Amino acid sequence: SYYDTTQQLSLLKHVLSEDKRPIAFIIAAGCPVSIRHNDAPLIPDVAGLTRKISDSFPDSLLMKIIQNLKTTIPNPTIEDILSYIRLLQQIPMSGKIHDVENSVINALEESICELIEEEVNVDLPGNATPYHKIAAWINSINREHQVEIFTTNYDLLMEQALEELNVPYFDGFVGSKRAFFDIRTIEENKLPSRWSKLWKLHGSINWQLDKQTQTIWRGTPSKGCSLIHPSHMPYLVMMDQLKLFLNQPSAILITCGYSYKDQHINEVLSQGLQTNPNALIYGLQYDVLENYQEAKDMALKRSNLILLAKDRAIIGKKEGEWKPFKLGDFQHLASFLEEISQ
Amino acid sequence: GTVQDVNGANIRVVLDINTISSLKFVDGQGYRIGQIGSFVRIPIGYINLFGIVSQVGAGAVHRWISVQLVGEEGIKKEFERGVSQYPTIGDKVHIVTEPDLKKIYGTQNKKYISLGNIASVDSIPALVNIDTLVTRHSAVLGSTGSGKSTTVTSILQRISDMSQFPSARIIVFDIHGEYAAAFKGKAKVYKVTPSNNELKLSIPYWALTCDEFLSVAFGGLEGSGRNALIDKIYELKLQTLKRQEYEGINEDSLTVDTPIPFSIHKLWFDLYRAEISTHYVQGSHSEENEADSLKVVPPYLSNRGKNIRKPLEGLASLLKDPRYEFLFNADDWSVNLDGKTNKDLDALLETWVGSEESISIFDLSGMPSSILDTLIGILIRILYDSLFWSRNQPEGGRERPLLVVLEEAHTYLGKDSRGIAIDGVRKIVKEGRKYGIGMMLVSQRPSEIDSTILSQCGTLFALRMNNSSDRNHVLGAVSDSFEGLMGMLPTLRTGEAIIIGESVRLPMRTIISPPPFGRRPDSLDPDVTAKWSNNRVQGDYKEVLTLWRQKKVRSQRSIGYEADSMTLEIEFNHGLVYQYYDVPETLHTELLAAESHGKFFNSQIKNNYRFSR
Amino acid sequence: VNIDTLVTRHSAVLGSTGSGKSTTVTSILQRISDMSQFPSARIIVFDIHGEYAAAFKGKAKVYKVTPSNNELKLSIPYWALTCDEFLSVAFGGLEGSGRNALIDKIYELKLQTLKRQEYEGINEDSLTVDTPIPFSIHKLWFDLYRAEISTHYVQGSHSEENEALLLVQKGDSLKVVPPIYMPHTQAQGATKIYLSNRGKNIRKPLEGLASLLKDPRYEFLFNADDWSVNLDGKTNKDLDALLETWVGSEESISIFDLSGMPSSILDTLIGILIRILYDSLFWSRNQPEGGRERPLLVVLEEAHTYLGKDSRGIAIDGVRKIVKEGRKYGIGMMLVSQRPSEIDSTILSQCGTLFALRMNNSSDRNHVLGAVSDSFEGLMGMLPTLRTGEAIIIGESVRLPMRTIISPPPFGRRPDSLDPDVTAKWSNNRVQGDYKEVLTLWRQKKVRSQRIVENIKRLPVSNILSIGYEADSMTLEIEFNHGLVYQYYDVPETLHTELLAAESHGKFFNSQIKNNYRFSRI
Amino acid sequence: KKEFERGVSQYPTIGDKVHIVTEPDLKKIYGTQNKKYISLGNIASVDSIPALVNIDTLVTRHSAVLGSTGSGKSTTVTSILQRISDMSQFPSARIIVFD
């Protein structure tokens, strides 16, 4: 019927105040858009980027691609159009359906990647950002188990904020000039207690492909050679580590700004929750609860996750609502974390 | 948490979870690791062996706890006392979650009444059968700072629902008169000098036994005066029987304890005229040789003078004392010079235990402390005799049981108390089990009450008790001792209680649900800071002297008014009446047109004119 | 379980109030006194709350205080008591010369009775105050009360022939009414009348005895039905009939229901009964009616209220004497209590067998552990977690201390006191009452109204077991279970005629007749 | 963050943390917003905290002063009477002393 916010907040503070249970973070596009340097948001989300690409790009020939995507799929985003372009470029004689030369689609893809790389790269504003506040919270407690951070974005705000307060982090790559990716150190998982690691699921802009042996590496951000691709084997390196951490007994994972639209991530989370009875994931849904039916399906099927919104909440596979939750947004979550820290 | 020991009635656990200890949540509800007030559950095959936690820490040997076994379930039947097989090593002990607690705290009987919410979770009810609460006994023990009035009044009001208890009958022997605001309109009020809406308590003295008459009126006569009083009482009873015919009463079987009125003012007049007036002619003491009765004024010396002049003088002084008005000057039982009253004692009984309400509040606040024990004994004995001698009719105590609550009983039920009230209480406790008369004790110093009388109470209401003597004395009277409940006594919040007895299936340390707003018991004590904060105004002690000489509390002097009388009147809450004098009518006319009903009053009428409450 | 040691070496049943010890005791008594196996059983129960009469419907005689349908009336003649117990019951233990005066009067009355009525083996030489010889108490009260108030007509001599009675009130001996005497006045002009010069200081005790005689609560003591004493000292029956009715009836179990007795003399009366039974079974230990040829068992309920450490009552002496000496004369004992910490340790230690039920607190468990002689650490740690109806038998009557489940009693034999029900009475709609009638009953000190029909003939058939009615009085009589009989007054013929033709016996009664008509339980 | 009230709610468990009380917390405990309470002195530990005592219940419920003759009970009684009968705050005080 009615669930009291105070009890849930107290339980969250209690579990966050204990260093025995390892913690994880999921930072989707909803957190980065919550910070605005100007009146407008500093970086718009996937919808904003898709709108900008559509308004910036005859235009009818380009729009035929979105029409073809909409024929069998809903309103496509940047990821959907990128996947379609990559699939078309996989087959040499695939542009005959649209009858547009043999390299116009590749030129459009290059223009799109240049546009997204130029748009996403921006310097962080002053120390009032929630990212700096979370980084400060990282050093607050001397946890014996490092906290893991998973990001689905593309920018470099996380590492900038972390290094602004001198906290170590590790993304798999080791090196100063080429940063050759290592698999042995990731598989060994023998790291010091003070060493935390930040894992990039969808890649970053500084990631580059050296071609030749198809080896990926990170370094100075260049133009063209980017691995922004969400799904397009580093991706398995992300997924197996995430799954292995989910199955650790007495593990807690928190998410913010994630709309449950990524089916594969939702499937992985559901599989991990079913596999591990001791796992626990807190979903901080945004806007209204009705906006994510997959969240309701996961809550009904899996009883190890709790979903809370600004108006309604479902705890233990039991539908309900508050009895008059600002924590849905990233700013209030960061404020909660910092007042716990003090 | 897996049990690794069986020690008769206290098992010990060795938890294997490294550091769970953080409100281990199951199915969206957060259970805690073994706490003081939590419940345990050790599964053995098919039956669920439950338990209650008593002590935590090194006191059990850290990872050892002191678990106490209470009960277990049969074949999915219910919560049963008496285990089948105490668990051994190898099985993990689980906890009683919220639904499991509901099942344990669930009852199929509709006589069970939900009295509140468990302190653990505010949803699970305390199903309490009210038959046990009224039929056996009750007792309320705790410190005054724990809020005893609130919990007691809440229990009484919940017990008295018109839809749930249409045949209720509750008598509260409150001494401070603090329950008038508690049930303003749901209970009658009986005082000595009521003001607005209360009935006036009246006690016919001739309806009591001879021993009570000797104790209260005669002051404890035992020699010649007592026997003369016996002779006079027998003669007066015979004269009353002869003058007026009483059904079932004649000159054949006139007993000493006969509740038939006899002249007492005339008796005092005779006992004064037989020892005051002088015989006109010596040798004879004739009544015609003189050398009022209702009025206390009395008119060779008379040879029939008694040696009870001092008791007679005491009786005469009592007859004029205003505090004895409710004792000797009952309205409908005012004994005429020939022993004739407008009404009978059946009218008194109908007025007391036959009103249209379910709860009746009788207050002895104005009673003198000189014979209060005898008065309490008289009231209890009158109720018991009325509902026992008429217990064969459906109007007796059996067919509509009664519950009498006695507060601050440690002064009248002490270890060495030899009064008449304690005898009546013992008689009730030993006989009313079939007669269906309930009793509930209220006190704030349990260490003084007799052990055996408290041991005869069915269910206890344990509040916060900081001193350890009270804890020891209470533990001496409870036969189901759980250290989880035995040690939580001195840290109870103001409003919580521990209910242990036959009225609950399991010992519940629940929360006394507060009574609805507007019904909160509180005696009308003066406000020290409010009274002492006002500036000094001129006084008139001549009126005080006149009142003291006259021994009268009535002076000679909603916004009402009377321009001829120049007395503006403003009324406060709770039935308070004020009469501000020397107030020009224009001021009150402006006040009636000021705001609505306030401000102006405190602004000008509060501290400028002599008032009268 | 051995039965010879269970009786000769005494027993005890201890448990908590929630452990259902009553069912265990009932089952044990039913099993021991089986007609098929033990045709010559002999059991006496000192029921206090009257919760055992219900269990034994027709298997045992019941001696209550006020009979209603078929139970007898308990009656203990006052002349069967000894001098000390009689003094402690009537006068409350006078210590002055009044005790000597009363003893002399008892001796004189007993001598006169022996002269009037011949008795075997008793003469003026072998007569003691202790001898149970009937004698009138009303005559004694009359004599002693008249020898203290009445004034002699002539001064100097205060003989009975000088009665200065104003004429009017001659007075009656059987009745409590005292005679009236003229006031003492030796002044000139009128006759000189002097008060009695032999009056003792026993006016108040005599007034108390008169009040006790007039009190209906002491009918079983001072108004025995077949053992009432006339002024000449003659009774309808003798003590042999009482003894035969107590421990010689055709029923194996006799139950004394002491619920309605006064609470201030219960200890003394229990001591009286114990002493009478012990003496009767001791002085005749050679005859076939004695204890040796037919052992007797005494069951005492709530033993913690009379066998305390510092109890000054009389029952404790009798209990100690039985426990110490019944092994030879064949008199057993069986103490039942729900508070072992109150029973005297020197008494609890001599009980051969212990039936330890579930105990909650620690004091009782510690006392039981201290008062045991055969303990196994495995079983004794199980005491606070015993199932309801399960017992741990320990003592000399078993080969090994074993944990048993007592066989439940047969259906319709579950003990249950007829305590009035709170829910039914409290939930019923309130009706008008008769204040005048209850006031008259209270003044009269009687429990029977005037409008009670005498001899209504009933017919066979919440449950209804019988139905009776009358057309002349128009009063309905409905008989329920447990011996309850009700009498509803002023009922039209239509209601009960329709009820007799209804589908069942009930429901409609609760629908229309239950709470509309004034009734009176008989 | 409401106030300090007598009576506990949930008892602690093994392994919990115990903390020393600092003077601000002592002020939070011994400090109250009720206007009836008046200051009679300071705590033994630190003199900053005032000793707030109810005055209406002290007068009406009952009182008592018990102590040895060498402990200066007369001075304490004089101080209490002077503080209770302050004219600025209580201009209508009425006290009778049977010296």
Asked whether the beta carbons of residue C439 and residue B258 sit closer than 8 angstroms, the reply is: no
Q: Give how far Cα C320 sits from Cα of A63, C82, C285, Å.
A: 112, 19, 20
8 Å CB contact between A216 and A210? yes
Residues of chain C with Cβ-Cβ distance to B136 below 8 Å are: none
Residue A271 CB neighbours (<10 A): 14
- Counting every residue written for chain A, the total comes to 342
Quick one: tokens of C91? Answer: 């006068």
Q: Are chains D and C touching, using the cut-off of 8 Å on CB pairs and a minimum of 3 such pairs?
A: no
> CA C218: distance to chain centroid?
10
8 Å CB contact between C351 and C12? yes
8 Å CB contact between A39 and A50? no
Asked whether the beta carbons of residue C381 and residue B8 sit closer than 8 angstroms, the reply is: yes
Integer Cα distance of B526 and B464 in angstroms: 27
Residue among B529, B531, B533, B537 with most chain D CBs within 10 A, to mutate: B529
Helix C203-214 vs helix C83-90: crossing angle, to nearest 10: 80
Q: After which residues is chain D broken (C to N over 2.5 A)?
A: none
- For chain B, say whether C184 makes contact (Cβ under 8 Å): no
Cα end-to-end span (Å), chain C: 44
Q: HEC string of chain A? A: CEECHHHHHHHHHHHHCCCCCCEEEEECCCCHHHCCCCCCCCCCCHHHHHHHHHHHCCHHHHHHHHHHHHHHCCCCCHHHHHHHHHHHHHCHHHCCCCCCCCCHHHHHHHHHHHHHHHHHCCCCCCCCCHHHHHHHHHHHCCCCCCCEEEECCCCCHHHHHHHHCCCCCCCCEECCCCCEECCHHHHHCCCCCCCCEEEECCCCCCEEECCCCCCEEECCCCCCCCCCCCCCCHHHHHHHHHHHHHCCCCEEEEEECCCCCCHHHHHHHHHHHHHCCCEEEEEECCCCHHHCHHHHHHHHHCCCEEEECCCEEECCCCEEEECCCHHHCHHHHHHHHHHHHC
Say if strands B79-81 and B65-73 run parallel, antiparallel, or are unpaired.
antiparallel
- For chain B, say whether D92 makes contact (Cβ under 8 Å): yes
- Which amino acid would we find at residue B34? G
B278: Cβ contacts below 8 Å, ≥ 6 apart: B290, B291, B300, B301, B302
Residue B83: which of B74, B93, B72 has the closest Cα? B72
Q: Give how far Cα C199 sits from Cα of C132, C183, C362, Å.
A: 29, 15, 59
- For chain B, say whether A306 makes contact (Cβ under 8 Å): yes
B27: Cβ contacts below 8 Å, ≥ 6 apart: A303, A316, A317, B97
- For chain D, say whether B532 makes contact (Cβ under 8 Å): yes
Radius of gyration of chain C (CA): 28
Coil vs helix vs strand at C171: coil
Asked whether the beta carbons of residue D7 and residue B536 sit closer than 8 angstroms, the reply is: no
A residues 14-53 lying closer than 8 A (beta carbon) to B: 14-15, 18, 20-21
Q: How big, in percent rounded to 5, are the helix, strand and coil portions of chain B?
A: 30, 20, 50
Integer Cα distance of C45 and C259 in angstroms: 13
Integer Cα distance of A244 and B607 in angstroms: 80
C residues 339-358 lying closer than 8 A (beta carbon) to B: 339, 358
Quick one: tokens of B3? Answer: 């049990």
E strands, C35-162, are 43-46, 60-64, 72-73, 151-152
Coil vs helix vs strand at B115: strand
8 Å CB contact between B461 and B499? yes
Residue B117 CB neighbours (<10 A): 16
Going across the sheet that includes A180-181, the strands are A173-174, A180-181, A216-218, A207-209
8 Å CB contact between A283 and A306? yes
Tokens 């109806």: give the residue. C389
Quick one: tokens of C137? Answer: 């108490």
Residue among B17, B24, B27, B35 with most chain A CBs within 10 A, to mutate: B27
Chain C: give the shortest CA distance to residue B459, in Å: 13
Residues of chain B with Cβ-Cβ distance to C521 below 8 Å are: 392
| Ramachandran angles phi, psi of B29, nearest 5° | -120, 135
Asked whether the beta carbons of residue B434 and residue C419 sit closer than 8 angstroms, the reply is: yes
Tokens 């479902």: give the residue. A314
Say if strands A23-27 and A148-151 run parallel, antiparallel, or are unpaired.
parallel
Asked whether the beta carbons of residue D8 and residue B119 sit closer than 8 angstroms, the reply is: no
B residues 452-511 lying closer than 8 A (beta carbon) to D: 464, 488, 491-494, 496
Residues of chain D with Cβ-Cβ distance to B496 below 8 Å are: 7
Quick one: tokens of C410? Answer: 């047969």
Coil vs helix vs strand at B72: strand
B20: Cβ contacts below 8 Å, ≥ 6 apart: A250, B33
Radius of gyration of chain A (CA): 21
Residue among C174, C385, C447 with most chain B CBs within 10 A, to mutate: C385
Integer Cα distance of C278 and C256 in angstroms: 16
Integer Cα distance of C304 and C343 in angstroms: 5
Cα end-to-end span (Å), chain A: 34
Residue B448 CB neighbours (<10 A): 16
Residue B533: which of D78, D51, D61, D56 has the closest Cα? D56
Quick one: tokens of C413? Answer: 């034999």
8 Å CB contact between C131 and C196? no
Kind and range of the H or E element at B451? helix B451-455
Cα end-to-end span (Å), chain D: 48
Tokens 């210590």: give the residue. C95
Integer Cα distance of B21 and B2 in angstroms: 15
Residues of chain B with Cβ-Cβ distance to D93 below 8 Å are: 532
- For chain B, say whether A303 makes contact (Cβ under 8 Å): yes
Kind and range of the H or E element at C113? helix C97-116
Could you tell me which chains touch chain C, where touching means 3 or more CB pairs under 8 A? B
Q: Which residue of B lies nearest to A250 if distances are taken between CA atoms?
A: B20
Say if strands A279-284 and A251-256 run parallel, antiparallel, or are unpaired.
parallel
- For chain B, say whether C9 makes contact (Cβ under 8 Å): no
Q: Which residue of B lies nearest to C427 if distances are taken between CA atoms?
A: B167
Integer Cα distance of B512 and B117 in angstroms: 7
Asked whether the beta carbons of residue B436 and residue C425 sit closer than 8 angstroms, the reply is: yes
| Ramachandran angles phi, psi of B139, nearest 5° | -160, 135
Integer Cα distance of A268 and A276 in angstroms: 12
Asked whether the beta carbons of residue B34 and residue D11 sit closer than 8 angstroms, the reply is: no
Residue B236: which of B251, B216, B214 has the closest Cα? B251
B277: Cβ contacts below 8 Å, ≥ 6 apart: B290, B291, B298, B299, B302
Q: Which residue of D lies nearest to B35 if distances are taken between CA atoms?
A: D13
Residue C515: which of B574, B212, B166, A288 has the closest Cα? B166
8 Å CB contact between C256 and C44? yes
Quick one: tokens of B538? Answer: 């001129």
Chain C: give the shortest CA distance to residue B526, in Å: 40
Residue among C423, C426, C432 with most chain B CBs within 10 A, to mutate: C426
Count how many Cα atoms sit within 13 Å of the Cα of residue A276 in the half-sphere of its side chain: 20
Interface residue ranges in chain B relative to chain A, Cβ cutoff 8 Å: 18-23, 25, 27-30
Q: Are chains A and D touching, using the cut-off of 8 Å on CB pairs and a minimum of 3 such pairs?
A: no
* Nearest CB neighbour to A303, from listed B21, B23, B27: B27
- For chain B, say whether D7 makes contact (Cβ under 8 Å): yes
> CA B603: distance to chain centroid?
42
Quick one: tokens of B313? Answer: 């003088």
Q: Give how far Cα C2 sits from Cα of B426, B469, C9, C291, C328, Å.
A: 42, 47, 11, 20, 18
Q: Give how far Cα B525 sits from Cα of B183, B362, B365, B518, B530, Å.
A: 18, 19, 14, 17, 12
Q: Give how far Cα A342 sits from Cα of A126, A133, C53, C57, D3, Å.
A: 21, 12, 74, 78, 21
Integer Cα distance of C154 and C193 in angstroms: 6
Helices H, strands E: what count in chain D?
3, 2
The CA-CA-CA angle for residues C27, C30, C36, to 5°, reads 140
Residue A88: which of A114, A74, A109 has the closest Cα? A109
Radius of gyration of chain B (CA): 32
C252: Cβ contacts below 8 Å, ≥ 6 apart: C33, C35, C38, C40, C41, C42, C43, C59, C60
Integer Cα distance of A296 and A289 in angstroms: 8
Integer Cα distance of A38 and B321 in angstroms: 90
Integer Cα distance of C268 and C465 in angstroms: 40
Residues of chain B with Cβ-Cβ distance to C418 below 8 Å are: 434
Instruction: Render the burial of A14-25: b for 16+ CB within 10 Å, e for the rest.
Output: ebbebeebbbbb
Could you tell me which chains touch chain D, where touching means 3 or more CB pairs under 8 A? B
Q: How big, in percent rounded to 5, are the helix, strand and coil portions of chain D?
A: 30, 10, 60
Residues of chain C with Cβ-Cβ distance to B427 below 8 Å are: 263
Integer Cα distance of A225 and C274 in angstroms: 112
Integer Cα distance of C281 and C296 in angstroms: 9
8 Å CB contact between C335 and C371? no
Radius of gyration of chain D (CA): 18
Quick one: tokens of A100? Answer: 């547009």
8 Å CB contact between B193 and B150? no
B139: Cβ contacts below 8 Å, ≥ 6 apart: B440, B441, B454, B457, B459, B460, B461
Integer Cα distance of C355 and C383 in angstroms: 11
8 Å CB contact between A134 and A337? yes
Integer Cα distance of C433 and D41 in angstroms: 65
Q: Give how far Cα D44 sits from Cα of B123, D50, D71, Å.
A: 45, 10, 16
Asked whether the beta carbons of residue B165 and residue C426 sit closer than 8 angstroms, the reply is: yes
- For chain C, say whether B135 makes contact (Cβ under 8 Å): yes
Residue B367 CB neighbours (<10 A): 18
Residue C430: which of B73, B459, B358, B408 has the closest Cα? B358
| Cα dihedral C109, C113, C119, C125 in deg (nearest 10) | 40
Quick one: tokens of C271? Answer: 């001591």
Integer Cα distance of B418 and D23 in angstroms: 54
Integer Cα distance of C367 and C83 in angstroms: 38
| Cα dihedral C202, C208, C213, C214 in deg (nearest 10) | 130
Residues of chain B with Cβ-Cβ distance to D55 below 8 Å are: 528-529
8 Å CB contact between B108 and B102? no
